[PDB]
């Protein structure tokens, strides 16, 4: 008989501990694995695939239309859309990125925001996208917007433009749930010159917008998502 002493914590059950256990089914042989395409190893692998952002959130019931950012022909100087960058809330929240970020407490890294244009091929347009780093207000006019991170996008044969929100930060991690100290800025978009439709054409054209994370990205300290809850256990 070897002398032992038990410490504080004996008998506790910590849902996060990782130890060995007896197998209830001694000697059982599991089914062989066969090959299946698509294996995922890290959630970091999947948040780099871009998905659509319901940017046009202004509706009243969920609709395919809140994915469409409208553009008006012949407007000059004006603003196309605006949003803050609380990736865990608001427009971002239902996107795959938003949806995964919510399983973690802290995030750090660059984001990739792209816009794909869908107007007739014989039209043309020049837009400016601007990222405003924390510390200033959402820009109120392009002059204000153009003094921060921006890209003049020229609509052409190449249909999409990929803007990166480079990680601009004092503190090396931000909270995924919106927090002030930790806030990330604003994203706005304005006409640089203006949309022009060809003859025989009319109305609004739309941009689709996507979001995905750069390879830069870090997420840490897992927790429970506000995105799902329940009141009684389900049954069959």
């Amino acid at each position: 008989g070897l002398p032992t002493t038990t410490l504080p914590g004996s008998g506790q059950f910590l849902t996060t501990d990782d130890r060995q256990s007896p197998s209830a089914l001694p000697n059982y042989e599991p089914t062989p694995r066969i090959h299946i395409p698509g294996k995922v190893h890290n959630l970091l692998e999947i948040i780099q695939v871009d998905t659509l952002i319901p940017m046009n959130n202004t509706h009243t019931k969920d609709e395919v239309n809140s994915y469409l950012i409208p553009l008006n022909a012949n407007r000059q100087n004006e603003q196309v859309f605006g949003t803050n960058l609380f990736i865990g809330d608001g427009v971002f929240k239902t996107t795959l990125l938003g949806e995964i970020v919510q399983y973690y407490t802290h995030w750090s890294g660059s984001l990739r925001f792209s816009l794909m244009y869908t107007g007739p091929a014989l039209s043309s347009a020049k837009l400016i996208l601007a990222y405003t780093p924390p510390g200033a207000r959402g820009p109120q006019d392009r002059r204000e917007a153009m003094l921060g991170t921006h890209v003049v996008w020229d609509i052409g044969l190449q249909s999409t433009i990929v803007m990166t929100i480079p990680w601009t930060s004092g503190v090396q991690f931000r909270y995924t749930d919106p927090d002030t100290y930790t806030s990330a800025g604003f994203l706005s978009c304005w006409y640089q010159t203006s949309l022009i439709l060809p003859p025989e054409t009319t109305g609004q054209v739309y941009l689709l917008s996507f979001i995905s994370a750069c390879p830069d990205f870090k997420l840490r300290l897992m927790k429970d998502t506000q995105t799902i809850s329940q009141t009684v256990a389900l049954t069959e």
């Binding site: 506790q12 059950f13 429970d224 506000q226």
Partner: protein, 273 residues
């Protein structure tokens, strides 16, 4: 190691005891610069004054309480202490607080011990055996609303289940967002005119929530939770003046008005012994 070397009479032009304190230095003067000494050894290393040792013992950081009782007809579990929580923080109880605030920035892993004891202040046939389930709820997680919400499923959130009367123990890595925790912060969360000032803005680390897993027996049972915290792997920067006045709030430096003189007045003269 010698604590003092042997030194004899001196009649020099080299005076180590005259200095100019205006410079900001504390010149390293020793007994042997001004009296005749004999050799003696230190026999000591200064082991128990290491900051790891100083901050490394468990201190009580929080006492809360929850009760097991019939929740039937309770409109606000939180309010009935059917479960309770704690807005994690290390500055609420002030013994450990004065020790940490000897430094400006501090970095360490935490080891928590949680002791839970039960009380049955009014007539019970017996003492029941309750299991507590303290669970960590970080910022931006579904806060729990009843004592038996979906929240308690805690599928992604670390939770420990232990018995009242026992102790639970586990250790959490340094969860700070920056490189160190700020013991002090002379800033705001943004440049608004009315936003709070301090660290309280800073050190919002989310809260911890406790509940009893047991349903109710015929009597009521009071369970009082004590959280102990031990720093391990300590790193501390920039020493500061120790706290002199009493504390009034978690996270602000504020002291109470009409406080009392903190320096003991002499019973006698400056000349008194």
């Amino acid at each position: 190691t010698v604590a003092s070397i042997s030194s004899g009479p001196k009649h020099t032009q080299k005076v180590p005891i005259l200095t100019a304190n205006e410079t900001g230095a504390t010149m390293p003067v020793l007994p042997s610069d001004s009296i005749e000494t004999r050799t003696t050894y230190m026999h000591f290393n200064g082991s128990e004054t290491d900051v790891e040792c100083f901050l490394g013992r468990a201190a009580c950081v929080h006492v809360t309480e929850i009760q097991n009782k019939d929740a039937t007809g309770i409109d606000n579990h939180r309010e009935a202490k059917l479960f309770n929580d704690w807005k994690i923080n290390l500055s609420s109880l002030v013994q450990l607080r004065k020790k940490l605030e000897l430094f400006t920035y501090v970095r360490f892993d935490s080891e928590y011990t949680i002791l839970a004891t039960a009380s049955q202040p009014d007539s019970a046939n017996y003492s029941s055996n309750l299991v507590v389930q303290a669970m960590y709820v970080p910022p931006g997680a579904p806060n729990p609303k009843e004592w038996d919400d979906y929240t308690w499923q805690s599928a992604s959130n670390p939770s420990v289940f232990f018995k009242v009367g026992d102790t639970s123990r586990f250790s959490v890595p340094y969860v700070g967002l920056a490189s160190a925790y700020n013991c002090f912060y002379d800033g705001y969360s943004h440049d608004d005119a009315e936003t709070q000032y301090g660290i309280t803005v800073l050190a919002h680390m989310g809260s911890m929530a406790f509940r009893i897993v047991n349903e109710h027996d015929e009597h009521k049972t009071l369970v009082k939770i004590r959280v102990y915290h031990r720093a391990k792997h300590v790193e501390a920067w920039i020493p500061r003046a120790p706290r002199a006045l009493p504390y009034t709030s978690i996270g602000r430096t504020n002291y109470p008005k009409n406080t009392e003189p903190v320096i003991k007045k002499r019973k006698g003269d400056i000349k008194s012994y």
